Amino acid sequence: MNLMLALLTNFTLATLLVIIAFWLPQLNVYSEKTSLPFSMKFFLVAITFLLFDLEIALLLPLPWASQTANLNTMLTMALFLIILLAVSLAYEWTQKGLEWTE
Amino acid sequence: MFMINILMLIIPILLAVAFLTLVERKVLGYMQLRKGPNVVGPYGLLQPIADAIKLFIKEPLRPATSSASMFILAPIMALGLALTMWIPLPMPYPLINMNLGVLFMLAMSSLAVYSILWSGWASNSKYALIGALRAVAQTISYEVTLAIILLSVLLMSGSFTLSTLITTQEQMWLILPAWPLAMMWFISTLAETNRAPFDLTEGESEGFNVEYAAGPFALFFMAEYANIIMMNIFTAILFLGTSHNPHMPELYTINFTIKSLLLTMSFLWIRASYPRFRYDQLMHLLWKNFLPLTLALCMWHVSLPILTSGIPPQT
Amino acid sequence: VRETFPEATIIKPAEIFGREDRFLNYFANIRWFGGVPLISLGKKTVKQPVYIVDVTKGIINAIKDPDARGKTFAFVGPSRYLLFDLVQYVFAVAHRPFLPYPLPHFAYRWIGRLFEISPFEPWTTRDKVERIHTTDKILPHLPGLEDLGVEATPLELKAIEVLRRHRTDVQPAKTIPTS
Amino acid sequence: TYKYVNLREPSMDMKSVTDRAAQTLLWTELIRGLGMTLSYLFREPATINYPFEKGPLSPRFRGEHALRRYPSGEERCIACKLCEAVCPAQAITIEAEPRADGSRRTTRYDIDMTKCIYCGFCQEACPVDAIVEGPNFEFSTETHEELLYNKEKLLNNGDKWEAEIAANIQADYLYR
Amino acid sequence: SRGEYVVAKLDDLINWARRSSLWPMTFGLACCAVEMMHMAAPRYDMDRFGVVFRASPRQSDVMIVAGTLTNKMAPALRKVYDQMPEPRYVVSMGSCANGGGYYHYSYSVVRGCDRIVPVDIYVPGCPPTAEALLYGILQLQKKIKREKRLRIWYRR
Amino acid sequence: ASKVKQDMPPVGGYGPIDYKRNLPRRGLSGYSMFAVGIGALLFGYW
Ligand SMILES: CCCCCCCCCCCCCCCCCC(=O)OC[C@H](COP(=O)([O-])OCC[N+](C)(C)C)OC(=O)CCCCCCCCCCCCCCCCC
Ligand SMILES: CCCCCCCCCCCC(=O)OC[C@H](COP(=O)(O)OCC[N+](C)(C)C)OC(=O)CCCCCCCCCCC
Ligand code: SF4
Ligand code: SF4
Ligand code: SF4
């Protein structure tokens, strides 16, 4: 109940400041003013982050995984995942995927 | 008593942000052989108040926006999440004692990237949207090292609780066994927060908030400066843990605060010393220097406790 | 004025339109509340708006012209319009959805009262509603712009320059023939 | 004679390669930069406390033009127009006639201070030290018309600044 | 007390804020921009008065026209002025921006920036010393301090 | 009937003025920077 009440305050306060910051200026009554080409490299960096992010999701439970009695199995699987994550980086690296020159 | 607790957290954060602008301007001035603000109030203490009043009574700038609803959503998200990342921090007792506090902070900081993205859309400027895409790409890229580096330090702590980092460091700061990670973690917080030498959004002759001027621009500024303090508070808890005496909690807060100020000052220290990276060069720093080393140190920090019999407790 | 300064020169213009006018910009700020309230439905109200530069050029030529002392002029536009047709044209040029609905004369007065309680420049008032819905008089016994060498500017020619800033091949409005 | 700025070969002995490896991995040269700005934090700043402190000037300083007098009050200017003929910006306008007592004096002496390039050629060309550039440099105005000086403004400046113009001329007339 | 007194203190507070946070946008067009840079240098340190070194045009409160304004550049300068959020002030620095200066009689020079934009302070010199420009910024602050926006509104 | 007096250098000239680059050599060697770095890790692991 505290967390729900904590999130409500932070965004309600942020909401109040945004609206008054939009309206408090609008009382000076100032004079009336009366006055992209797709890049495939930006997409590739966004996709690569996603696939690395999904690998990070699998690595997040490692602190709990080290409390098990099958450490020989757990350490093998943990290092396998991290290594395969390195292989992906090695693959993109060697295929000019990390470059920015057109 | 809890509602009073939230205000005892929110209000000082905004006052800390307010006077960080003053401290940043004087510190840069003295490293530049200048004085910085010293006229508006004694020693410039009233300079933040003058700027605040001036900004909030200046003419609105909002031009035609295609997603006016998205124009108002971005500052709310940016400032709502910036304050939300403080509630689990142990100082020494957290406002919301979470069992998964570390994951909560990663999750909330991975949503602040929407404020950048939504502000680019709501500006009706094809050259502002390109700037936002670059800013988004940099932020998500350095979120990869923050999570892997953070995961490597928790394998010595044993849980995602932020309060257990105090126990883990009761004999020794984690920086000593994990200074290679602290070096990369610290620079990631610079790139994550878009601070020099990584502030290519301020490449005046080389931002997505241009469509915000005064008012909402002031709110984006507060959110950004609130995250610098939070990141440097997170760094202190993670690598410079303070001793906690249950009968004298205020001793922790004094020592903890001093550490978090020095790290915040060092951000200003760095901004005064270096030129900034090209966009491709700060990407090559992450993908071709930090990520290879972070992955290698994650393998090492998974196997190290096992081979030394130093696996930490789950509880 | 005609008694204190007999040789004065009284100018009588209609609703002047221009970049900073309160006439075409007035029929473009009824979008944040709903449709377009009007006494009747804009019928039985005839308007003859005049361009701001025509009024300005007329006042200048009255200073230079000797045979304008002690005289009254009626600066009016070239064409006459119905308030419904005129307002429809304004929204078409400004690319705004036009949803006209009638509103009682007394009902328009009350919302005028609501908008005149503010301490700033009221958006609208009771008097403003009356003047917009007043029919522009036809005084053919007064010399107008043509008597000072000024060709009245049609509203269709120079309405885009005013309504360009309200936008997020337009048919000219139907006009009353001289008959 | 000449020198090469960037024509040195880095050593490849293992120690030097490791010295460069330490610099790359441990950021040693980036930490000297931090030391050089921490030094400046503890140096006294060069800022002065304007307007209570002023930046140093010299007797030759070229500031606001002004018209001078003899010790008797008579104007020094005898309407010769040498200053007008040498002004590169054509900022001086002079008209003259015989004064009531037969003297040769100006009826107009205007300087468009927005055309003037504050070069001092006029005070070089004047044979009687009439027009000078005083030491004043704080006469910013709020309208463009206040910078179009006529003979009254310039004579007022001379009476207003003579005490300081005379001492600046006395300090530097032997170099000119 | 009287309404004028109450609304006169609010005028002072907003006047104080606006002159204590004068953020300039410097149009550095010619040599006068060097002296503008010297006003930011350590000796004068304009940032100690609250005058930031260089703000973006959309965050700026005052425009410093420091240099020669040519016909080719005139429309660009007007556009930047039209995009400045209010309140906005213009400082004309040097003889070129004041009245054309050395190039007054040129075919390609605007004879004073006050033909394109309104000017609040004229700073004479070629170039004005960094101290003369600073004296002109402190005069603009004194000019903001004398504003009576709320008194005029109250007495309307 | 005094002597000529203009701005001249003092008899014997001015003192020497440095211009060559002076960036002093600081810090330890690469070997000793890694030895301290590795040693810090080992003590922390212990
Ligand atoms: C038995 C032991 C087993 C375990 C041992 C595990 C550790 C072994 C030692 C590992 C080496 C140490 C790694 C350090 C990180 C290296 C990152 C890297 O790639 O560097 C090269 C990178 C890239 O180097 P580069 O640009 O010259 O190019 C390298 C690659 N080539 C040459 C091919 C192009 O450099 C940087 O990271 C600099 C980033 C900019 C930094 C600007 C801010 C400086 C701020 C300085 C203060 C920092 C304080 C930090 C402390 C914070 C306290 C909380
Ligand atoms: C009740 C309505 C709220 C506003 C309250 C008044 C604040 C504005 C006055 C300060 C600026 C000013 O006055 O400038 C600085 C003044 C001197 O000004 P001066 O040269 O004598 O003014 C000359 C006349 N002018 C201004 C018309 C040209 O220094 C002072 O001694 C003020 C220091 C005390 C300020 C205490 C503030 C407490 C209020 C906090 C909550 C709002
Ligand atoms: S100082 Fe130069 S520009 Fe000014 S009046 Fe004298 S000659 Fe003309
Ligand atoms: S000021 Fe001097 S140079 Fe100029 S007209 Fe007078 S006497 Fe001649
Ligand atoms: S006024 Fe003088 S210094 Fe300034 S731009 Fe013109 S010539 Fe250059």
PDB file of N, CA, C and O in Angstrom, chain C residues 75-132:
ATOM      1  N   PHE C  75     -15.766  53.526 -44.716  1.00  0.00           N
ATOM      2  CA  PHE C  75     -14.854  52.561 -45.319  1.00  0.00           C
ATOM      3  C   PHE C  75     -15.454  51.168 -45.191  1.00  0.00           C
ATOM      4  O   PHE C  75     -15.586  50.642 -44.083  1.00  0.00           O
ATOM      5  N   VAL C  76     -15.809  50.561 -46.322  1.00  0.00           N
ATOM      6  CA  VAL C  76     -16.402  49.232 -46.339  1.00  0.00           C
ATOM      7  C   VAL C  76     -15.701  48.392 -47.396  1.00  0.00           C
ATOM      8  O   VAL C  76     -15.100  48.910 -48.338  1.00  0.00           O
ATOM      9  N   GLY C  77     -15.790  47.078 -47.228  1.00  0.00           N
ATOM     10  CA  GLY C  77     -15.199  46.153 -48.161  1.00  0.00           C
ATOM     11  C   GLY C  77     -15.944  46.126 -49.479  1.00  0.00           C
ATOM     12  O   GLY C  77     -16.986  46.765 -49.644  1.00  0.00           O
ATOM     13  N   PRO C  78     -15.418  45.387 -50.448  1.00  0.00           N
ATOM     14  CA  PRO C  78     -16.054  45.349 -51.770  1.00  0.00           C
ATOM     15  C   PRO C  78     -17.265  44.432 -51.820  1.00  0.00           C
ATOM     16  O   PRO C  78     -18.194  44.670 -52.598  1.00  0.00           O
ATOM     17  N   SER C  79     -17.274  43.392 -50.992  1.00  0.00           N
ATOM     18  CA  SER C  79     -18.291  42.353 -51.050  1.00  0.00           C
ATOM     19  C   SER C  79     -18.991  42.225 -49.706  1.00  0.00           C
ATOM     20  O   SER C  79     -18.410  42.503 -48.654  1.00  0.00           O
ATOM     21  N   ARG C  80     -20.250  41.797 -49.754  1.00  0.00           N
ATOM     22  CA  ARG C  80     -21.054  41.536 -48.570  1.00  0.00           C
ATOM     23  C   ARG C  80     -21.250  40.036 -48.416  1.00  0.00           C
ATOM     24  O   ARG C  80     -21.329  39.307 -49.408  1.00  0.00           O
ATOM     25  N   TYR C  81     -21.319  39.576 -47.170  1.00  0.00           N
ATOM     26  CA  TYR C  81     -21.416  38.157 -46.867  1.00  0.00           C
ATOM     27  C   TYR C  81     -22.450  37.931 -45.776  1.00  0.00           C
ATOM     28  O   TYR C  81     -22.789  38.838 -45.013  1.00  0.00           O
ATOM     29  N   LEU C  82     -22.954  36.704 -45.717  1.00  0.00           N
ATOM     30  CA  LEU C  82     -23.742  36.251 -44.583  1.00  0.00           C
ATOM     31  C   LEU C  82     -22.801  35.740 -43.503  1.00  0.00           C
ATOM     32  O   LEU C  82     -21.806  35.073 -43.796  1.00  0.00           O
ATOM     33  N   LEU C  83     -23.121  36.057 -42.249  1.00  0.00           N
ATOM     34  CA  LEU C  83     -22.254  35.636 -41.157  1.00  0.00           C
ATOM     35  C   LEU C  83     -22.049  34.130 -41.164  1.00  0.00           C
ATOM     36  O   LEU C  83     -20.977  33.651 -40.780  1.00  0.00           O
ATOM     37  N   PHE C  84     -23.055  33.366 -41.588  1.00  0.00           N
ATOM     38  CA  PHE C  84     -22.870  31.924 -41.708  1.00  0.00           C
ATOM     39  C   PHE C  84     -21.873  31.594 -42.808  1.00  0.00           C
ATOM     40  O   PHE C  84     -20.925  30.831 -42.593  1.00  0.00           O
ATOM     41  N   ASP C  85     -22.073  32.158 -44.001  1.00  0.00           N
ATOM     42  CA  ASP C  85     -21.155  31.890 -45.101  1.00  0.00           C
ATOM     43  C   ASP C  85     -19.759  32.408 -44.787  1.00  0.00           C
ATOM     44  O   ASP C  85     -18.760  31.739 -45.074  1.00  0.00           O
ATOM     45  N   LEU C  86     -19.671  33.598 -44.192  1.00  0.00           N
ATOM     46  CA  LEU C  86     -18.368  34.165 -43.861  1.00  0.00           C
ATOM     47  C   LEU C  86     -17.612  33.266 -42.892  1.00  0.00           C
ATOM     48  O   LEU C  86     -16.437  32.948 -43.111  1.00  0.00           O
ATOM     49  N   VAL C  87     -18.273  32.834 -41.817  1.00  0.00           N
ATOM     50  CA  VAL C  87     -17.605  31.992 -40.833  1.00  0.00           C
ATOM     51  C   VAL C  87     -17.265  30.634 -41.433  1.00  0.00           C
ATOM     52  O   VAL C  87     -16.229  30.043 -41.111  1.00  0.00           O
ATOM     53  N   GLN C  88     -18.123  30.118 -42.313  1.00  0.00           N
ATOM     54  CA  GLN C  88     -17.804  28.865 -42.990  1.00  0.00           C
ATOM     55  C   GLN C  88     -16.529  29.001 -43.810  1.00  0.00           C
ATOM     56  O   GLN C  88     -15.680  28.104 -43.809  1.00  0.00           O
ATOM     57  N   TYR C  89     -16.379  30.121 -44.518  1.00  0.00           N
ATOM     58  CA  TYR C  89     -15.168  30.353 -45.295  1.00  0.00           C
ATOM     59  C   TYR C  89     -13.939  30.401 -44.397  1.00  0.00           C
ATOM     60  O   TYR C  89     -12.891  29.839 -44.735  1.00  0.00           O
ATOM     61  N   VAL C  90     -14.051  31.059 -43.242  1.00  0.00           N
ATOM     62  CA  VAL C  90     -12.908  31.188 -42.343  1.00  0.00           C
ATOM     63  C   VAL C  90     -12.407  29.813 -41.921  1.00  0.00           C
ATOM     64  O   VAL C  90     -11.200  29.547 -41.918  1.00  0.00           O
ATOM     65  N   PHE C  91     -13.325  28.919 -41.553  1.00  0.00           N
ATOM     66  CA  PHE C  91     -12.916  27.592 -41.107  1.00  0.00           C
ATOM     67  C   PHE C  91     -12.366  26.764 -42.261  1.00  0.00           C
ATOM     68  O   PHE C  91     -11.440  25.967 -42.071  1.00  0.00           O
ATOM     69  N   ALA C  92     -12.919  26.932 -43.462  1.00  0.00           N
ATOM     70  CA  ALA C  92     -12.390  26.212 -44.614  1.00  0.00           C
ATOM     71  C   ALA C  92     -10.965  26.650 -44.927  1.00  0.00           C
ATOM     72  O   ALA C  92     -10.100  25.814 -45.213  1.00  0.00           O
ATOM     73  N   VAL C  93     -10.701  27.957 -44.876  1.00  0.00           N
ATOM     74  CA  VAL C  93      -9.354  28.452 -45.137  1.00  0.00           C
ATOM     75  C   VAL C  93      -8.399  28.005 -44.039  1.00  0.00           C
ATOM     76  O   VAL C  93      -7.221  27.735 -44.296  1.00  0.00           O
ATOM     77  N   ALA C  94      -8.884  27.926 -42.802  1.00  0.00           N
ATOM     78  CA  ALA C  94      -8.073  27.472 -41.678  1.00  0.00           C
ATOM     79  C   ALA C  94      -8.078  25.959 -41.515  1.00  0.00           C
ATOM     80  O   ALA C  94      -7.436  25.451 -40.591  1.00  0.00           O
ATOM     81  N   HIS C  95      -8.782  25.228 -42.380  1.00  0.00           N
ATOM     82  CA  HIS C  95      -8.787  23.764 -42.355  1.00  0.00           C
ATOM     83  C   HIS C  95      -9.268  23.224 -41.012  1.00  0.00           C
ATOM     84  O   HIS C  95      -8.741  22.236 -40.498  1.00  0.00           O
ATOM     85  N   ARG C  96     -10.282  23.869 -40.438  1.00  0.00           N
ATOM     86  CA  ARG C  96     -10.860  23.390 -39.193  1.00  0.00           C
ATOM     87  C   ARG C  96     -12.229  22.765 -39.446  1.00  0.00           C
ATOM     88  O   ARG C  96     -12.966  23.232 -40.320  1.00  0.00           O
ATOM     89  N   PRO C  97     -12.598  21.712 -38.716  1.00  0.00           N
ATOM     90  CA  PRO C  97     -13.940  21.142 -38.886  1.00  0.00           C
ATOM     91  C   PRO C  97     -15.016  22.128 -38.455  1.00  0.00           C
ATOM     92  O   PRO C  97     -14.995  22.647 -37.337  1.00  0.00           O
ATOM     93  N   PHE C  98     -15.969  22.377 -39.349  1.00  0.00           N
ATOM     94  CA  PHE C  98     -17.027  23.352 -39.119  1.00  0.00           C
ATOM     95  C   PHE C  98     -18.304  22.623 -38.719  1.00  0.00           C
ATOM     96  O   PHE C  98     -18.859  21.858 -39.513  1.00  0.00           O
ATOM     97  N   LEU C  99     -18.767  22.872 -37.496  1.00  0.00           N
ATOM     98  CA  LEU C  99     -19.956  22.228 -36.938  1.00  0.00           C
ATOM     99  C   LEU C  99     -20.883  23.300 -36.385  1.00  0.00           C
ATOM    100  O   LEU C  99     -21.054  23.426 -35.166  1.00  0.00           O
ATOM    101  N   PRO C 100     -21.506  24.091 -37.256  1.00  0.00           N
ATOM    102  CA  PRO C 100     -22.371  25.174 -36.776  1.00  0.00           C
ATOM    103  C   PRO C 100     -23.633  24.625 -36.132  1.00  0.00           C
ATOM    104  O   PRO C 100     -24.272  23.714 -36.662  1.00  0.00           O
ATOM    105  N   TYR C 101     -23.990  25.188 -34.980  1.00  0.00           N
ATOM    106  CA  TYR C 101     -25.254  24.885 -34.338  1.00  0.00           C
ATOM    107  C   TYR C 101     -25.826  26.182 -33.783  1.00  0.00           C
ATOM    108  O   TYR C 101     -25.067  27.041 -33.312  1.00  0.00           O
ATOM    109  N   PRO C 102     -27.143  26.354 -33.821  1.00  0.00           N
ATOM    110  CA  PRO C 102     -27.737  27.591 -33.307  1.00  0.00           C
ATOM    111  C   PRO C 102     -27.686  27.644 -31.789  1.00  0.00           C
ATOM    112  O   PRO C 102     -27.508  26.634 -31.105  1.00  0.00           O
ATOM    113  N   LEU C 103     -27.840  28.860 -31.263  1.00  0.00           N
ATOM    114  CA  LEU C 103     -27.873  29.078 -29.830  1.00  0.00           C
ATOM    115  C   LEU C 103     -28.776  30.274 -29.563  1.00  0.00           C
ATOM    116  O   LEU C 103     -28.700  31.267 -30.300  1.00  0.00           O
ATOM    117  N   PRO C 104     -29.631  30.220 -28.540  1.00  0.00           N
ATOM    118  CA  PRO C 104     -30.549  31.339 -28.297  1.00  0.00           C
ATOM    119  C   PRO C 104     -29.800  32.635 -28.027  1.00  0.00           C
ATOM    120  O   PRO C 104     -28.687  32.639 -27.497  1.00  0.00           O
ATOM    121  N   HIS C 105     -30.432  33.748 -28.401  1.00  0.00           N
ATOM    122  CA  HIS C 105     -29.808  35.051 -28.202  1.00  0.00           C
ATOM    123  C   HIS C 105     -29.514  35.300 -26.729  1.00  0.00           C
ATOM    124  O   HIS C 105     -28.437  35.796 -26.379  1.00  0.00           O
ATOM    125  N   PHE C 106     -30.459  34.964 -25.849  1.00  0.00           N
ATOM    126  CA  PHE C 106     -30.223  35.121 -24.418  1.00  0.00           C
ATOM    127  C   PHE C 106     -29.174  34.139 -23.916  1.00  0.00           C
ATOM    128  O   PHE C 106     -28.427  34.456 -22.985  1.00  0.00           O
ATOM    129  N   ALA C 107     -29.110  32.945 -24.510  1.00  0.00           N
ATOM    130  CA  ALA C 107     -28.118  31.962 -24.085  1.00  0.00           C
ATOM    131  C   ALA C 107     -26.707  32.424 -24.418  1.00  0.00           C
ATOM    132  O   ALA C 107     -25.764  32.161 -23.661  1.00  0.00           O
ATOM    133  N   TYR C 108     -26.538  33.108 -25.551  1.00  0.00           N
ATOM    134  CA  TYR C 108     -25.219  33.611 -25.916  1.00  0.00           C
ATOM    135  C   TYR C 108     -24.782  34.724 -24.972  1.00  0.00           C
ATOM    136  O   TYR C 108     -23.589  34.875 -24.686  1.00  0.00           O
ATOM    137  N   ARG C 109     -25.736  35.510 -24.470  1.00  0.00           N
ATOM    138  CA  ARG C 109     -25.398  36.561 -23.516  1.00  0.00           C
ATOM    139  C   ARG C 109     -24.770  35.982 -22.255  1.00  0.00           C
ATOM    140  O   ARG C 109     -23.789  36.527 -21.737  1.00  0.00           O
ATOM    141  N   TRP C 110     -25.322  34.880 -21.744  1.00  0.00           N
ATOM    142  CA  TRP C 110     -24.826  34.321 -20.490  1.00  0.00           C
ATOM    143  C   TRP C 110     -23.384  33.846 -20.624  1.00  0.00           C
ATOM    144  O   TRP C 110     -22.537  34.167 -19.784  1.00  0.00           O
ATOM    145  N   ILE C 111     -23.079  33.077 -21.673  1.00  0.00           N
ATOM    146  CA  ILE C 111     -21.698  32.637 -21.863  1.00  0.00           C
ATOM    147  C   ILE C 111     -20.792  33.836 -22.095  1.00  0.00           C
ATOM    148  O   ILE C 111     -19.596  33.791 -21.787  1.00  0.00           O
ATOM    149  N   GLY C 112     -21.339  34.923 -22.642  1.00  0.00           N
ATOM    150  CA  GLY C 112     -20.589  36.166 -22.688  1.00  0.00           C
ATOM    151  C   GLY C 112     -20.275  36.694 -21.302  1.00  0.00           C
ATOM    152  O   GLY C 112     -19.183  37.208 -21.054  1.00  0.00           O
ATOM    153  N   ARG C 113     -21.233  36.578 -20.378  1.00  0.00           N
ATOM    154  CA  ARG C 113     -20.976  36.973 -18.998  1.00  0.00           C
ATOM    155  C   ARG C 113     -19.888  36.111 -18.374  1.00  0.00           C
ATOM    156  O   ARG C 113     -19.030  36.615 -17.642  1.00  0.00           O
ATOM    157  N   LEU C 114     -19.907  34.807 -18.652  1.00  0.00           N
ATOM    158  CA  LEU C 114     -18.913  33.913 -18.070  1.00  0.00           C
ATOM    159  C   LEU C 114     -17.504  34.299 -18.498  1.00  0.00           C
ATOM    160  O   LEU C 114     -16.570  34.269 -17.688  1.00  0.00           O
ATOM    161  N   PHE C 115     -17.329  34.664 -19.767  1.00  0.00           N
ATOM    162  CA  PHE C 115     -16.007  34.948 -20.304  1.00  0.00           C
ATOM    163  C   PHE C 115     -15.526  36.364 -20.018  1.00  0.00           C
ATOM    164  O   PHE C 115     -14.377  36.680 -20.346  1.00  0.00           O
ATOM    165  N   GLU C 116     -16.357  37.222 -19.429  1.00  0.00           N
ATOM    166  CA  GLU C 116     -15.946  38.578 -19.099  1.00  0.00           C
ATOM    167  C   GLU C 116     -15.637  38.753 -17.618  1.00  0.00           C
ATOM    168  O   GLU C 116     -15.414  39.882 -17.171  1.00  0.00           O
ATOM    169  N   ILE C 117     -15.617  37.663 -16.848  1.00  0.00           N
ATOM    170  CA  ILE C 117     -15.259  37.755 -15.436  1.00  0.00           C
ATOM    171  C   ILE C 117     -13.750  37.755 -15.234  1.00  0.00           C
ATOM    172  O   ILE C 117     -13.276  38.142 -14.158  1.00  0.00           O
ATOM    173  N   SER C 118     -12.982  37.347 -16.239  1.00  0.00           N
ATOM    174  CA  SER C 118     -11.539  37.267 -16.092  1.00  0.00           C
ATOM    175  C   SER C 118     -10.931  38.665 -15.980  1.00  0.00           C
ATOM    176  O   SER C 118     -11.510  39.643 -16.458  1.00  0.00           O
ATOM    177  N   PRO C 119      -9.758  38.784 -15.349  1.00  0.00           N
ATOM    178  CA  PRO C 119      -9.092  40.091 -15.267  1.00  0.00           C
ATOM    179  C   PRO C 119      -8.313  40.470 -16.513  1.00  0.00           C
ATOM    180  O   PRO C 119      -7.833  41.609 -16.596  1.00  0.00           O
ATOM    181  N   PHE C 120      -8.171  39.565 -17.475  1.00  0.00           N
ATOM    182  CA  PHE C 120      -7.380  39.791 -18.671  1.00  0.00           C
ATOM    183  C   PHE C 120      -8.296  40.172 -19.832  1.00  0.00           C
ATOM    184  O   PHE C 120      -9.503  40.364 -19.665  1.00  0.00           O
ATOM    185  N   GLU C 121      -7.718  40.291 -21.025  1.00  0.00           N
ATOM    186  CA  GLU C 121      -8.497  40.541 -22.228  1.00  0.00           C
ATOM    187  C   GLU C 121      -9.532  39.434 -22.401  1.00  0.00           C
ATOM    188  O   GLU C 121      -9.162  38.289 -22.691  1.00  0.00           O
ATOM    189  N   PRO C 122     -10.823  39.721 -22.231  1.00  0.00           N
ATOM    190  CA  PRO C 122     -11.826  38.659 -22.363  1.00  0.00           C
ATOM    191  C   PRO C 122     -11.813  38.047 -23.755  1.00  0.00           C
ATOM    192  O   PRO C 122     -11.620  38.739 -24.756  1.00  0.00           O
ATOM    193  N   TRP C 123     -12.025  36.731 -23.812  1.00  0.00           N
ATOM    194  CA  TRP C 123     -12.169  36.071 -25.104  1.00  0.00           C
ATOM    195  C   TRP C 123     -13.395  36.590 -25.841  1.00  0.00           C
ATOM    196  O   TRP C 123     -13.346  36.839 -27.052  1.00  0.00           O
ATOM    197  N   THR C 124     -14.502  36.763 -25.126  1.00  0.00           N
ATOM    198  CA  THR C 124     -15.718  37.329 -25.692  1.00  0.00           C
ATOM    199  C   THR C 124     -16.522  37.945 -24.558  1.00  0.00           C
ATOM    200  O   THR C 124     -16.289  37.657 -23.382  1.00  0.00           O
ATOM    201  N   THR C 125     -17.470  38.800 -24.929  1.00  0.00           N
ATOM    202  CA  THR C 125     -18.278  39.519 -23.957  1.00  0.00           C
ATOM    203  C   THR C 125     -19.669  39.726 -24.539  1.00  0.00           C
ATOM    204  O   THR C 125     -19.928  39.413 -25.702  1.00  0.00           O
ATOM    205  N   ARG C 126     -20.569  40.262 -23.712  1.00  0.00           N
ATOM    206  CA  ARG C 126     -21.927  40.516 -24.182  1.00  0.00           C
ATOM    207  C   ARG C 126     -21.927  41.495 -25.346  1.00  0.00           C
ATOM    208  O   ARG C 126     -22.649  41.302 -26.330  1.00  0.00           O
ATOM    209  N   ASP C 127     -21.125  42.556 -25.252  1.00  0.00           N
ATOM    210  CA  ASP C 127     -21.111  43.562 -26.308  1.00  0.00           C
ATOM    211  C   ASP C 127     -20.490  43.014 -27.586  1.00  0.00           C
ATOM    212  O   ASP C 127     -20.940  43.338 -28.690  1.00  0.00           O
ATOM    213  N   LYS C 128     -19.456  42.185 -27.459  1.00  0.00           N
ATOM    214  CA  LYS C 128     -18.819  41.617 -28.641  1.00  0.00           C
ATOM    215  C   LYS C 128     -19.802  40.774 -29.441  1.00  0.00           C
ATOM    216  O   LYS C 128     -19.822  40.832 -30.674  1.00  0.00           O
ATOM    217  N   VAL C 129     -20.622  39.978 -28.755  1.00  0.00           N
ATOM    218  CA  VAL C 129     -21.587  39.128 -29.447  1.00  0.00           C
ATOM    219  C   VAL C 129     -22.599  39.980 -30.200  1.00  0.00           C
ATOM    220  O   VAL C 129     -22.995  39.652 -31.324  1.00  0.00           O
ATOM    221  N   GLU C 130     -23.042  41.082 -29.592  1.00  0.00           N
ATOM    222  CA  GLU C 130     -24.001  41.958 -30.256  1.00  0.00           C
ATOM    223  C   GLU C 130     -23.415  42.562 -31.527  1.00  0.00           C
ATOM    224  O   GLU C 130     -24.061  42.567 -32.580  1.00  0.00           O
ATOM    225  N   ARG C 131     -22.186  43.078 -31.450  1.00  0.00           N
ATOM    226  CA  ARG C 131     -21.605  43.760 -32.602  1.00  0.00           C
ATOM    227  C   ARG C 131     -21.385  42.805 -33.766  1.00  0.00           C
ATOM    228  O   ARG C 131     -21.643  43.159 -34.922  1.00  0.00           O
ATOM    229  N   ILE C 132     -20.904  41.594 -33.490  1.00  0.00           N
ATOM    230  CA  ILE C 132     -20.698  40.627 -34.563  1.00  0.00           C
ATOM    231  C   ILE C 132     -22.021  40.301 -35.243  1.00  0.00           C
ATOM    232  O   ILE C 132     -22.074  40.089 -36.460  1.00  0.00           O
TER     233      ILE C 132
END
